[PDB]
Subunit: 158 residues, 2 copies
């Protein structure tokens, strides 16, 4: 299952945030996201702390409890799609993502709208000895990538 | 130098996770509203849960297990009194954990049981493909810890 980068990684709020896509992936449970057979790609957000993180995460650690929605735009046509990622585990670890129905060939921009763990129920110590400070404000990161589809082998045509 | 934290019982390793229990002084948490404020509690009780080597649910050794749903049953064996509650996911300076501020039920020998439900209950999904997939979650299960509580300190 071949992975393709979407744009360039960005470092923001002491996290590294990358976007990747691959062929649609069957997931359990069912009912929240689009089924694989009804999608064109599986789109992911890879998000991990970097050194100096002030919210309690060590370098390289996954950031859990994020709420992440996406705005996908095919800039060739102007077509826009809104959706929301789920937290997902795979053999190479936890991430966020969704199966997506794409909008044809084009130069795309995808924006990930990211809310901090407080919005999904994660609390924080506030004592002087073990406390951490307030969360960063919800923020956006965007990726620009050229999309032509994936073929029956799950590969980008050459 | 020693951190003021009191182990509750002994760690156990089940379902390819190491599960430990500790308590400390009540801790004020944000956001406010959910759960007992520190002023109305006697201890802050924690669940310390990380994968061990060989975990098949996608977590590397030592990694925090996120998206668990954990409830507790606390019994003072000296008086018979029981309390049931839930833990919250929490981050502190040394990382994510689960816990709650607790009003205790007097000095005594206690048992605390953690009922643990897998990340699927709180919305975590899994790839099921041949290449990157992980299999079914384990079923909900109980772990318990016995400790002598005399107050702090
Ligand atoms: Cu995925
Ligand atoms: Cu936004
Ligand atoms: Cu805590």
């Amino acid at each position: 299952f071949k992975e393709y980068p979407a744009g360039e990684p960005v470092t923001m709020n002491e996290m590294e945030l990358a976007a990747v896509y691959l062929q649609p992936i069957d997931m359990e449970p069912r009912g929240m996201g689009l089924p694989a057979a009804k999608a064109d790609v599986h789109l992911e957000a890879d998000i991990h702390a970097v050194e100096g993180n002030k919210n309690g995460f060590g370098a390289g650690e996954w950031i859990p409890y994020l709420t992440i929605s996406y705005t996908l735009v095919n800039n060739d046509t102007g077509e826009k799609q809104e959706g929301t990622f789920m937290p997902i585990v795979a053999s190479d670890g936890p991430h966020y993502g969704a199966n997506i129905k794409m909008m044809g060939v084009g130069n795309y921009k995808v924006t990930y709208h990211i809310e901090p763990p407080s919005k999904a129920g994660m609390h924080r110590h506030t004592d002087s000895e073990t406390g951490v400070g307030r969360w960063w404000k919800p923020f956006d990161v965007s990726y620009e990538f050229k999309y032509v589809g994936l073929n029956s082998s799950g590969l980008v045509p050459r």
